[PDB]
């Protein structure tokens, strides 16, 4: 990788999130979104390192702080859509052509830390909050499918979550040092998703009733000893990090235990590997993987970018010295974008 371009957003506030749109066809524009302050901005990647500003969404509330964004598509037209959320605890669905808000969802009792779309169903949106819960929404029928939390749920702010390859289960993590598994291919959850598609408030005077999921299907606090701020699946294995200068590769149960045989009472975990690094000991730093899960990237608090081949390279620039909060690879893994605390954006080409 070589640094081919850099820019700074006029607001001068930290950029907390970045995502390339992985739903665009080959030959169509390569676009990424950034979130920081009360803004969402779209950019296009052109040849010879060129980055073109497309449009921006500026929230009516000057005190809103966006923390996360995620891309999906309309199941009938295949047109892209962008979801954004932050400190207000309000989810906004944005049309990327006009950069206008189509609709919004209220409900979480505090800030939203991460948004993720289901890998098979573009209408199923997962949100994780400071209110200690996860929520699953159906954005086609505007319904709240389920709330994951309660008696055996997280006992402090939830920081991250990820669906597995097929979207049969979710792993969540947060300030309580725990990683919790929630199966969504159960008879109860499959029926609830089916019912959310049948609901229409114009054909009944009764409200849609959400599932209250009080119990996870697995839980551990034995991987990290501080806030767990990023989790991703790697097949049936899990990659997770805290502020302790390592990404840990682990699995529930003993070495030969199959993930789908794991019982909620499972007391063991198996450590498989560790990715060690330096100067990344502050809260709120995300790692990412490329589409094919062959590359892993993480920025540090002094502007250095670490890249591992999953099948370590340190990327540095004399003008890049602020904390790198999140990174994103283009679908073909030829471009890597990094966003910083000083509102700067960095483009690395392979
Ligand atoms: C410049 S400062 O004032 O020191 C500062 C630093 C960080 C944050 C901050 C960042 N991001 C999140 N939330 C979502 C997010 C964004 C990125 C990575 C990440 C997560 C959750 C896990 O990892 N924040 C939620 N509440 N505060 C923050 C706020 C102020």
From Swiss-Prot:
Subunit text: Component of the PRC2/EED-EZH2 complex, which includes EED, EZH2, SUZ12, RBBP4 and RBBP7 and possibly AEBP2. The minimum components required for methyltransferase activity of the PRC2/EED-EZH2 complex are EED, EZH2 and SUZ12. Component of the PRC2/EED-EZH1 complex, which includes EED, EZH1, SUZ12, RBBP4 and AEBP2. The PRC2 complex may also interact with DNMT1, DNMT3A, DNMT3B and PHF1 via the EZH2 subunit and with SIRT1 via the SUZ12 subunit. Interacts with HDAC, HDAC2, histone H1 and YY1. May interact with ITGA4, ITGAE and ITGB7. Interacts with CDYL. Interacts with BMAL1.
WD repeats: 10-53, 61-104, 107-147, 153-194, 223-260, 278-311, 319-350
Principal subcellular localization: nucleus
Organism: Homo sapiens (Human)
Residues that bear N6,N6,N6-trimethyllysine: 116, 187, 203
Annotated phenotype, changing residue 16 to A: Abolishes binding to H3K27me3
Localization per Swiss-Prot or TrEMBL: Nucleus; Chromosome
Residues of the full protein shown: 82 to 439 of 441
Function: Polycomb group (PcG) protein. Component of the PRC2/EED-EZH2 complex, which methylates 'Lys-9' and 'Lys-27' of histone H3, leading to transcriptional repression of the affected target gene. Also recognizes 'Lys-26' trimethylated histone H1 with the effect of inhibiting PRC2 complex methyltransferase activity on nucleosomal histone H3 'Lys-27', whereas H3 'Lys-27' recognition has the opposite effect, enabling the propagation of this repressive mark. The PRC2/EED-EZH2 complex may also serve as a recruiting platform for DNA methyltransferases, thereby linking two epigenetic repression systems.
Modified residues (N6,N6-dimethyllysine): 116, 187, 203
GO CC terms, sorted: chromatin silencing complex; cytosol; ESC/E(Z) complex; nucleoplasm; nucleus; pronucleus; sex chromatin
Annotated GO MF terms: chromatin binding; enzyme activator activity; identical protein binding; methylated histone binding; transcription corepressor binding
Keyword terms: Acetylation, Chromatin regulator, Chromosome, Disease variant, Host-virus interaction, Methylation, Nucleus, Phosphoprotein, Repeat, Repressor, Transcription, Transcription regulation, WD repeat
Family membership noted in the UniProt record: Belongs to the WD repeat ESC family.
Biological process (GO), any one: regulation of adaxial/abaxial pattern formation
Known disease link: Cohen-Gibson syndrome: An autosomal dominant overgrowth disorder characterized by accelerated osseous maturation, advanced bone age, skeletal abnormalities including flaring of the metaphyses of the long bones, large hands with long fingers and camptodactyly, scoliosis, cervical spine anomalies, dysmorphic facial features, and variable intellectual disability.
UniProt region (Required for interaction with the matrix protein MA of HIV-1), positions on chain: 68-222, 220-350
The protein's name in its UniProt record: Polycomb protein EED
Post-translational modifications reported in the UniProt record: Methylated. Binding to histone H1 'Lys-26' promotes mono-, di-, and trimethylation of internal lysines.
UniProt comment concerning the protein's domains: The WD repeat domain mediates recognition of trimethylated histone peptides at the consensus sequence Ala-Arg-Lys-Ser. This is achieved through an aromatic cage encircling the methyllysine, and involving Phe-16, Tyr-67 and Tyr-284.
Tissue-specificity statement: Expressed in brain, colon, heart, kidney, liver, lung, muscle, ovary, peripheral blood leukocytes, pancreas, placenta, prostate, spleen, small intestine, testis, thymus and uterus. Appears to be overexpressed in breast and colon cancer.
Domain of life: Eukaryota
Annotated positions of the N6-methyllysine modification: 116, 187, 203
Stretch list, region Interaction with EZH2: 1-350
Induction: Expression is induced by E2F1, E2F2 and E2F3.
Lineage, uppermost ranks: Eukaryota, Metazoa, Chordata, Craniata, Vertebrata
